[PDB]
Structure formats: structure tokens, C-alpha cells
Chain A
Amino acid sequence: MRIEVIRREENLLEFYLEGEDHTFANLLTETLHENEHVTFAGYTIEHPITMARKPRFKVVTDGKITPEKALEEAAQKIFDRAREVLEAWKAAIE
């Protein structure tokens, strides 16, 4: 996994996330949408049919939070929710 910053301007970050694909990219983008201060989050796939395949994200905020902080908040939510779901799963099966 590696972040490559493609573009920066006021309240805007565009980046590649090498090593990832639809699974994380969709979950991250949908989680970002929960944040009222995120005015856009989306991704497209670059190099879709070679080994260079990677998602290209764009994240835009209203300025009350940075794209980077929105991204960290969304990723933390994913971590926390996966943790909670794993605990519930283990409770059901072991």
C-alpha cells in the first residue's frame, strides 16, 4: 500500500492508493459521505487490466476539516466497525 498525491488545491486532494481496489475504495468513499463536511468523495480505477491497477480518489471538503483529516476519520470508522463486527461474529461462533 502506498499513497501517491496527484493534485492539491484549496480543500481538495486527489491521490492514488497503490495496493487497493474496489473493496477498500468503495467502503472508504461511502464512509466519507457520512461526514457533512465532505462535499465530494469518489474514485475511479486507473490501469484496470494490468498489474498497475489502482484506485484514483478525489476528496473535497468545505474547509472546516482537511481532506486528510476526513480520510483519517473515515478509515478509523472502518477499523472500529470491522472490530465491532468481528467481536459479534466471534461471539456467535465460538
Chain B
Amino acid sequence: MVEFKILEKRPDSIKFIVSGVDVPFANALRRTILSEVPTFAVDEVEFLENDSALFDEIIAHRLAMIPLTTPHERFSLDALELDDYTVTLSLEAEGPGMVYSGDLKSSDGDVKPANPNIPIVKLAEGQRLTFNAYARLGRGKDHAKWQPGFVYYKYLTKIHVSKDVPDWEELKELAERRGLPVEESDEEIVITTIKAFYLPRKFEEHMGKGIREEIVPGSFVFTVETNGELPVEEIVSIALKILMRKSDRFINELHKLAD
């Protein structure tokens, strides 16, 4: 009786309701996405030349933070022990001009900047920049550079507003204005919080009387954005596979206690 309802797909992002689960599982899904789902990211940079205005260390950080396409069809991204495969992203540039992510040349076409338009560093005339940047699989829990995106989640709820509440009409109007479902009866309006609702200060006094927010048990609204390493739906799939792999391996380790 677990169900997903996909509500909205937007650039690099998705909003869905998951039902028939619970708070620990919702917490675990969010954490797994942020902390465990792996990506390729620049991890080490060998500079050969840098005549730019910036430190090696600053350029290396900017390279680390470029989202790299991560080929989930090639590498097992739910693996507990990640493939140590290293990709070389190289640059050999001379000013004048801006160096962009798109100027990086990859040893492996499957792993390169998802966005070619990210400015890295401007070079003046005569200034050279030459390096080999080494990208590897890693996890957000190790360094932010490997985190695949961002996760926002909330209880699915119904906000009940009694028509005894003066100007309840403003709350129906606000909900409609922001695309929240509203059901209207003789007694009340009911607002489904597929997004956060911001109760105007005017109505705070009515909380606990005329206005009540009721959680829908077992249902949660997730909003997920990818940085571009992975499609947002694949991020979710990988996270769920990771929980299967972890639990399976833990059972195997438990059996060794028996012995």
C-alpha cells in the first residue's frame, strides 16, 4: 500500500507525494539522497601552470564544485564499495578570456561538466592555465562536492478553516493563488498542503479553534532538485537501492556473529 503520486516536474526537479510509509523511512530516504547517493566530482588537481589572478586552491575548489555527469548505466551507484575509476578533466588555456566549465576536456565523454557555461577564472593576456583534474566517485557525507542535489520534505496535511473564522475567504483565495487544493463545504474550507502554507498573522489567534492542521498519516511531500550529475528520478531510485544493499550486507555481517 505504498504509493507515489508525481505532482509536478520542473527544471532539474520534481515534487511527489509518497504515501504508506512513515517518518523514519521518510527521514532515511532524504538522508540517503543527501549523504549516500554517489556522484563523480573533481577530487584532486595537478596544476602545471597557473598565471591567473587566483590561487591554485581556489581554482581547485571551483573545479570540485562543477556538477559532473555521472553515468548510472556504467557504474553501480548503489554499490557499498564504489568503483575507484578516475577520470581526467584537462585544461590548457591562455588568456585573454574567461575559462568556462565547457573548456574542460575529459578523458571519458560520459563524465564531464553537465553545464558547459560555468565561469571558472578569467585570464588576462599572456596568462596561462594548465592542469589535470582527477574526478572520482564519492558521497555527500564525505564532502559537499559529491552531494547530488537538495531535498525538501514535509508532512502532507489538511488545514481546516471553519467558516466561523472571519475572512476565511482570504485563506481560500491565498491557497488558490499558490496552487494548493481547496475543498469547500458549508462548514469549512480544507487546504491540502502540497506546499508550505504561510498563515497570515491576522489568523494566528484562530489556531486551535477555528483553524486546525491535520497530518495525513503516512504521507509525505518531497521536493527534490538535482545539481545535474544525475536525473532527479534516478537519484531517488539509487537511494532506495542503497537502503536495500546496506540492509542486505548488514544481515550478512550479523550471520558471522553466530558464527
Q: Which of A82, A86, A88 contacts B247 (CB 8 A)?
A: A82
Q: Count of B residues near A, CB < 8 Å? A: 38
Contacts of B221-259 to chain A: CB distance below 8 A? 233, 236-237, 240-241, 243-244, 246-251, 253-254, 256-258
Q: Tell me whether A3 is interfacial, beta carbon within 8 Å.
A: yes
Q: Do most interface residues of chain B lie in helix, strand or loop, or is the interface mixed?
A: helix
Chain A residues whose CB sits within 8 angstroms of the CB of B6 once the complex forms: 92-93
Q: Count of A residues near B, CB < 8 Å? A: 36
Q: Say yes or no: A68-B257 contact (C-beta < 8 A), given A23-B36, A89-B236.
A: yes
Q: Tell me whether A40 is interfacial, beta carbon within 8 Å.
A: no
Q: Tell me whether A45 is interfacial, beta carbon within 8 Å.
A: no
Q: Tell me whether A65 is interfacial, beta carbon within 8 Å.
A: no
Chain B residues whose CB sits within 8 angstroms of the CB of A17 once the complex forms: 250
Q: Which of B16, B25, B250 contacts A24 (CB 8 A)?
A: B250
Q: Tell me whether B122 is interfacial, beta carbon within 8 Å.
A: no
Q: Say yes or no: A26-B16 contact (C-beta < 8 A), given A68-B254, A93-B6.
A: no
Question: Which of B27-35, B57-65, B168-176 lies on the face that meets chain A?
Answer: B27-35
Q: Which of B4, B28, B251 contacts A26 (CB 8 A)?
A: B28
**Measured between C-beta atoms, what is the minimum distance from A66 to chain B in Å?**
10
Whether A92 and B16, one on each chain, are in contact in the complex, defined by CB atoms closer than 8 angstroms, is: yes
Residue of B20, B31, B247 with most chain A CB atoms under a 10 A cut-off? B247
Whether A90 and B28, one on each chain, are in contact in the complex, defined by CB atoms closer than 8 angstroms, is: no
Residue of B nearest to A78 (CB): B247
Known: A3-B257, A78-B247, A86-B237. 17 other contacts (CB 8 A): A2-B253, A20-B246, A26-B24, A27-B28, A68-B257, A71-B250, A72-B251, A75-B247, A75-B250, A75-B251, A75-B254, A76-B251, A81-B2, A82-B243, A85-B18, A89-B236, A92-B4
30 contacts between A and B (CB under 8 A): A1-B80, A3-B254, A17-B250, A19-B80, A21-B35, A22-B35, A24-B246, A26-B24, A26-B28, A30-B24, A31-B24, A71-B254, A75-B250, A75-B251, A75-B254, A79-B244, A81-B25, A82-B243, A82-B247, A85-B21, A85-B25, A85-B240, A86-B241, A87-B2, A88-B3, A88-B18, A89-B4, A89-B240, A92-B3, A93-B237
- Interface of B toward A, CB cutoff 8 Å: 2-6, 16, 18, 20-21, 24-25, 27-29, 31-32, 35-36, 80, 141, 233, 236-237, 240-241, 243-244, 246-251, 253-254, 256-258
